[PDB]
Nucleic acid binder design. Structure first.
Lengths: 386, 132, 63
RNA sequence: UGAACAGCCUCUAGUUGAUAGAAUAAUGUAGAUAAGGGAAGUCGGCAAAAUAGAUCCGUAACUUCGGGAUAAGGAUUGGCU
RNA sequence: UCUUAAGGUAGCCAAAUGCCUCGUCAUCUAAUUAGUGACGCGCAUGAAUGGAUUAACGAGAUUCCCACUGUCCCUAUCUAC
RNA sequence: CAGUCAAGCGUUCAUAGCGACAUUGCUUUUUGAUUCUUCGAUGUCGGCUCUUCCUAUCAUACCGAAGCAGAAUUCGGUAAGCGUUGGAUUGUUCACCCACUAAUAGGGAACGUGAGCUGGGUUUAGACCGUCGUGAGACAGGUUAGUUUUACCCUACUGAUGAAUGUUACCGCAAUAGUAAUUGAACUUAGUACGAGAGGAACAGUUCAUUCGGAUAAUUGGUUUUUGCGGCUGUCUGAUCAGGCAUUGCCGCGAAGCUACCAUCCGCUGGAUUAUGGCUGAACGCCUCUAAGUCAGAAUCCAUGCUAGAACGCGGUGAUUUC
C-alpha cells in the first residue's frame, strides 16, 4: 500500500558507505584546472587544526540590513608550519588513467619525514635512503636522466612535500606526507621550480592570501557504534513500544525479500573524510612577529593564542591561518587545504575583510580577560605575588 | 512583508495561549494557524519574534471571539540572537492585535517591542512605546 | 564592540554573551555568565552577595 | 529524628552468602534531568511530573441536615538569646 | 369492530435500548460522528420481567476546566547492571 | 480512466472549453463469479516508523492552444529529479470541517510492514440493555474489561578484521557502485508593460527565507559521577576541624566531553538531449522544422565536484636478515 503521509527521506544518498577512512590524513581527489600562463605555485597546503576563536569584522554588502557595520562570527585557526619540499612525482597519461612514471627524492632527508617510513623507529637501524644518496656523488647523473624523462613524458607533474613537526606543540615526531600539484607554466618550468626547491621550505604566504575562496579536506571525528536515531535522524518510537524505541520500526517490505540498502541501519558514525566548500580566508598570520591577535582598530599587544593556550593543543608560534566557519575534524587533526577549483566571482567572494577585534579570552571555561595586563589592572594586588 | 526578516528560531508553537498588550479589549491569544512555514511530517508549526500569525481569544471581550482572526506577536520567550551577537529573551510572550494588512484595532500597545518588529510591519511601530 | 558593565555584580561585557530578562518597564539588564543570571533569577538581591565589585566598593574591600 | 512497630542511622546479636576481572559501543533493564510551548501525540492525561506534614482565617451547589470538607482557595514553618 | 387482553397510564429517551443517524435545535471549539440539555407515531423504552431525582461512596466508563509535565514539537546527556 | 463519429451547448460558429443518442479499449487501488494453492496452522482491521517503485501530473522546470487585453483561470506535451502539512470527532480504511503553503495528486510492494510496536474495534470465556423464541439460546443491534511467546542459526543490510600474489612501509591512479539539493517571498524593475479604468506584470541585480543533507561546539541552553566547591537535614565517631550511611541523601553554581535549525558554516558549473520554437531544401517546378545535415533548449542524461575503492584491477619508490 502507498505511504499514508509522504515525508522527505532521511540521510544523504551520496555519502555511502559511512565507514572509516583508509588513512588518518584525508586524500585529495581533485585539483584546480592547469593554466599554463600563470607563474607556477602550489595549489594546496598542509596544516594541523588548532582551534577556533571569536573575531569581529565589517559587514560590507549592498542590499543588506546594515552597511559598514560590525558583526560577529566563528573562525577556525589552523596551525600550518612551513612545508619542506623533498621530491616531485611525474604522472604520465594513459587510456586507463594517470600512471606514476618515476619518483625523485632529495639528498638530505630529515628525521621527521624519515620516521614516516618506519613503524619502530627506536629498533630500526636508520638504513633508509642510504644507497640512494650515493646517486649524487660523482655529478648527480643518476637522476638527470630521470629529470629529462620527467621533462619529456609525464604531462602532469606534482611535487611531494612534507611538514616540519618539531615546531608544533603536538608530541608526535612524525612528519605527515601528502601530495602537492603544480599549476602554471610549462612542464619544464614546473620541474625546474621543483628541483630548485629541493631541501628547501616555502612559507604559506606564497600559497594563500587574504580575500580568497579556500576549500578544506580532512577526516572527521569518530563516535563508534551508534543507533539510527543520531546516525541518520529517524523518528524514535513512542514510549509505549516494546523491546526498546531507538531503532527503525520498519526496514522494508515482504517483496523483495531483502533489506533495502537505502534503509537507515545502525552502524558507525564519524571518522569519515569530508569535503567543505566555500570557506573564506579572513587573515593570514606570521609566526616570526608579535601582534598576531592585534588589528589596526585594536592595537592591544596580544597574540592569537588564548589564555593558557588552546584547549588540548597548546600555543601558536608558527604561521597560522584563520578561516570562516567550522572545519571538518577535531583539534590537532591534520587538515590539507585546497584552493577553489572554479573561479567563483559572483558577489560573496569579492568583498574586502578588515578585522577589528580578536578574542583571546580563556576558552577553558567562561574566561573574560584577554591579556595579563588587563587582568592585573582590573584585579589589583593579589596574595600569591608576595 | 516589506523586508526579509532573519533566520527563524522557534519557541511559540501551535497550542500556546499568549496574552495581549494592546487596547482592542483582547486579553489572551490562542495560536491556531501560522503561515510562512512549510510541510513536514509530525512537525508542529511555531512562531518567532514577530510573524504574521492568526489566532483566537480564550478570555476577554464577548465579541472578539468565535472567529479566525489575524494577530501579530511582539515579544518572545526563547533566546534570540542578533547578528551583532547578543542573546535576547523577553520575559513574557506578548503580541498586538492586527488585521491581515497590519492595521490597528486598538489604540496603543503596552510595554516594550522588539526592534525586528519595528523593521517589520510599521503601523505597530507607529503606535508603540520604547523599541528594543 | 564597546564594552558594557554587568548589571548584577559589575564586570566587562564582551560581544558574544549576555542575558536580558527585561522587566516590562525596559530596565535592560545585561549579565555575563550563567551564574549571574541564575543568581538574579530567584531574586538573590545583590545587596548581600559577597564576592561583588558592587560590594568591592560598598563593603569597602580592596580600596 | 520522628504523632507513630511509617522511612533512615546507631547499640546487643548475626552476616559479608549470590562465578570474578579489565574495558564503558549501540540497542536494552532500573533511577533522574532538559531552555520555550503545556496534551497540539495517542482510541483514551497511558507513564512521569505537579499539591502533599503541622499551625491560623475562610470554605460553595445539593441534602435524608448526619455529609460534601483536608472542598476550592490564602499566610508561616531554620538557628540562637 | 375484531383472535383475544386492554392498546403504553404516570414517567423517560437517539439514554448502555434508535436500522434510517454523523436524526433536528441550542451550548462547548478556529474546526467536533465526541459531551450536555431538549424535540419523540419511540424498527424495538416504560412501571417488583420495576421508571426518575437521587444525599454520601465506587482501583466502574465518558466529556469539559486550572497548575503540571519529553506524550509531542525535537531530541540530547548522566548513572548501576 | 482514455479514444472514434457528430444532433447540438458555447449570442453567429464542432472540437477555446463541453458534447447526448452509440461504439472500440485500458490497469486491477472498489465490489463481484469459480475455489487452483493453504484448514498435522502464510498470525486477520486500523494507526505510528521506515525504504522503494508507477504515471492516469497537484505544484516546480521548459513549451503549445483559448472568445489568453493584464492578472487570474482552463486544456494538452516532455516530465518521477524534488515536495505534497498541522489539527476537532470517529478504531477507523472512507467522509466532513479549521488554517497554512506552490499544493496539501492518484496507487502498489502477501488489501507493504505484530520474532518492529500499539490492542480500540472485530474475534473466546464475564456482564447489561432492546427484539425474537415457553425454553436453553440467536441478533452482519448497542456498551464495559479482557495474557499479543522466542532469534543465538542461514541469507541480506549496517559496519569491522582477515591468510594467500616475494615480506614490509609510503605516495598513488580509477573500472565499478551511489549521488543532492528543492521551492517561495520582498526592494529595484513598476504602479511600468497591458488595459479606458478598475485592475495589473515578467526577465536581469540584491536581500533572503521553507524543507533536507554534510560537518564542528568559539559563543548560548541542556546534561552532573569532575561527585569540583559551597550550603542544608536525620543518625553515628566524647566536642571542634575533618568525617560515614541514608541504593547518586537534597539544593545552588558547576570545569571537560557530548549535543541541540534550541548553536554555527557550507551545499559547484560544462557538455549532450525530451517537449517546443527555428534554417536550407525536394518529394509535391510552389510551400514545408525532416526525408539528409543543422541551431537554441527542461528540476532530463552524462561529465566538473563528493563518498567507498576490484579485500583475485594496476604503477612508482626505501631498505630487503654476514651469525
Amino acid at each position: 500500500s502507498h505511504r499514508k503521509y509522504e515525508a522527505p527521506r532521511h540521510g544523504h544518498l551520496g555519502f555511502l558507505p559511512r565507514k572509516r577512512a583508509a588513512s588518518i590524513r584525508a586524500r585529495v581527489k581533485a585539483f584546480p584546472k592547469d593554466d599554463r600562463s600563470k607563474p607556477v605555485a602550489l595549489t594546496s597546503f598542509l596544516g594541523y587544526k588548532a582551534g577556533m576563536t571569536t573575531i569581529v569584522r565589517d559587514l560590507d554588502r549592498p542590499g543588506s540590513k546594515f552597511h559598514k557595520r560590525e558583526v560577529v562570527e566563528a573562525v577556525t585557526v589552523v596551525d600550518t608550519p612551513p612545508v619542506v619540499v623533498v621530491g616531485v612525482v611525474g604522472y604520465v597519461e594513459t587510456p586507463r588513467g594517470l600512471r606514476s612514471l618515476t619518483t625523485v627524492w632529495a639528498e638530505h632527508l630529515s628525521d621527521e619525514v624519515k620516521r614516516r617510513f618506519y613503524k619502530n623507529w627506536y629498533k630500526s637501524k636508520k638504513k633508509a635512503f642510504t644507497k640512494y644518496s650515493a646517486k649524487y656523488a660523482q655529478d648527480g647523473a643518476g637522476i638527470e636522466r630521470e629529470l629529462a624523462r620527467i621533462k619529456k613524458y609525464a604531462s602532469v607533474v606534482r611535487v611531494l612535500v612534507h611538514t616540519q613537526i618539531r615546531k608544533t606543540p603536538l608530541a608526535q615526531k612524525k612528519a605527515h606526507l601528502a601530495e602537492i600539484q603544480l599549476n602554471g607554466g610549462s612542464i619544464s618550468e614546473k620541474v625546474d621550480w621543483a628541483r630548485e626547491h629541493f631541501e628547501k621550505t616555502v612559507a604559506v604566504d606564497s600559497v594563500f592570501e587574504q580575500n580568497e575562496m579556500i576549500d578544506a579536506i580532512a577526516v572527521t571525528k569518530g563516535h563508534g557504534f551508534e543507533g539510527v536515531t543520531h546516525r541518520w535522524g529517524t523518528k524514535k518510537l513512542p514510549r509505549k513500544t516494546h523491546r526498546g524505541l531507538r531503532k527503525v520500526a520498519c526496514i522494508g517490505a515482504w517483496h523483495p525479500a531483502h533489506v533495502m540498502w537505502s534503509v537507515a541501519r545502525a552502524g558507525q558514525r564519524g571518522y569519515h573524510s569530508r569535503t567543505s566548500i566555500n570557506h573564506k580566508i579572513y587573515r593570514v598570520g606570521k609566526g616570526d612577529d608579535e601582534a598576531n591577535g592585534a588589528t589596526s582598530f585594536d592595537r592591544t599587544k596580544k597574540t592569537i593564542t588564548p589564555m593558557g593556550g588552546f584547549v588540548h593543543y597548546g600555543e601558536i608560534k608558527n604561521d597560522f591561518i584563520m578561516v570562516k566557519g567550522c572545519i571538518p575534524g577535531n583539534r590537532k587533526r591534520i587538515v590539507t587545504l585546497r584552493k577553489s577549483l572554479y573561479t567563483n566571482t559572483s558577489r560573496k567572494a569579492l568583498e574586502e575583510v578588515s578585522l577589528k577585534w580578536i578574542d583571546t579570552a580563556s576558552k577553558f571555561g567562561k574566561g573574560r580577560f584577554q591579556t595579563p595586563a588587563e587582568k592585573h589592572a582590573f584585579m589589583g594586588t593579589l596574595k600569591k605575588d608576595l | 512583508a516589506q523586508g526579509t526578516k532573519f533566520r527563524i528560531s522557534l519557541g511559540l508553537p501551535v497550542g500556546a495561549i499568549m496574552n495581549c498588550a494592546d487596547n482592542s479589549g483582547a486579553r489572551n491569544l490562542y495560536i491556531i494557524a501560522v503561515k510562512g512555514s512549510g510541510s513536514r511530517l509530525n512537525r508542529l508549526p511555531a512562531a518567532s519574534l514577530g510573524d504574521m500569525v492568526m489566532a483566537t481569544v480564550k478570555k476577554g471581550k464577548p465579541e472578539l471571539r468565535k472567529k479566525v482572526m489575524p494577530a501579530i506577536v511582539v515579544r518572545q520567550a526563547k533566546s534570540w540572537r542578533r547578528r551583532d551577537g547578543v542573546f535576547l529573551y523577553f520575559e513574557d510572550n506578548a503580541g498586538v492585535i492586527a488585521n491581515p494588512k497590519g492595521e490597528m484595532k486598538g489604540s496603543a500597545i503596552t510595554g516594550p517591542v522588539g526592534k525586528e518588529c519595528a523593521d517589520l510591519w510599521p503601523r505597530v511601530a507607529s503606535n508603540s512605546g520604547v523599541v528594543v | 564592540m564597546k564594552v558594557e558593565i554587568d548589571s548584577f555584580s559589575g564586570a566587562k561585557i564582551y560581544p558574544g554573551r549576555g542575558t536580558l530578562f527585561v522587566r516590562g518597564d525596559s530596565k535592560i539588564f545585561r549579565f555575563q555568565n550563567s551564574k549571574s543570571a541564575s543568581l538574579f533569577k530567584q531574586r538573590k538581591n545583590p545587596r548581600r552577595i559577597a564576592w561583588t565589585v558592587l560590594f568591592r566598593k560598598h563593603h569597602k574591600k580592596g580600596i
